[PDB]
Structure 1
């Protein structure tokens, strides 16, 4: 009896980005710790989580991101994802607009521990990824 919820991807949505910033969450999660998305400082972006619901309607879904710099915790954000019914086609949850930090002192890599859960603390999927703040895209 398959998992009711399957998280399939994370996308850093940003118009200015020279190319797609996507993670296939159905693959090897450990690999992302060795990778990072370049993100120009000060730009606005959104995090898009792609997922599927196989058998039953869900409610009170939540997406959580804890941020770190050099392994030192900074903050935690809990996003309400909502309710979704079973469907073959993936759903796409979008966080509200966020802004990349800005300034030389803010540049560098940051790690993000992500958790896609429900109102029961059920861990549908947990993964760690990174973005690197730079002065320019290239």
Structure 2
């Protein structure tokens, strides 16, 4: 009954953001639905998922993200994360560089449905968060 994978954080890594953009996924996941990260339009960023493995090697780990606008499904990306052995120290998975969309028509809030899984389709963690694209920070 000790969970094999504990997903601990999501971080938006953006060198031009004025402050830290982090979710503690060991907390109240419902609260994130009430919050949002602001990204300046057009900026480069990466998504960092922090997690721990406790007992057994996990293979074919995968990070799945669905993006919604106005409740309408507009993007789905899957990222292969890899294989990881148990240890005390957190692992950090980083996506490739992504770009915030740009232009008046792309500005506003988007809802993100995230899932961390593997080749067994285990629901290691599923959570929801929001991203708001603005002209400036």
Question: Could you tell me the TM-score, scaled by structure 2's length?
Answer: 0.99
Aligned equivalents of 2:36 and 2:45: distance in 1?
A: 16
Aligned equivalents of 1:70 and 1:31: distance in 2?
A: 20
Deviation at 1:75, TM superposition (A): 1.1
RMSD across aligned positions (CA): 0.5
Aligned equivalents of 1:4 and 1:110: distance in 2?
A: 31
Gaps of 5+ in 2: none
Gaps of 5+ in 1: none
Aligned equivalents of 2:121 and 2:112: distance in 1?
A: 19
Aligned equivalents of 1:77 and 1:30: distance in 2?
A: 23
Query: Following superposition, which runs of at least 4 residues in structure 1 exceed 2 angstroms of deviation?
Result: none
Number of matched residues?
137
Question: Could you tell me the TM-score, scaled by structure 1's length?
Answer: 0.98
Aligned equivalents of 2:120 and 2:75: distance in 1?
A: 22
Aligned equivalents of 2:118 and 2:57: distance in 1?
A: 12
Matching residue of 2:130: 130
Deviation at 1:121, TM superposition (A): 1.1
Aligned equivalents of 1:119 and 1:41: distance in 2?
A: 35
Q: 3-state SS of the aligned residue for 2:105?
A: helix
Aligned equivalents of 1:39 and 1:32: distance in 2?
A: 16
Q: 3-state SS of the aligned residue for 1:61?
A: strand
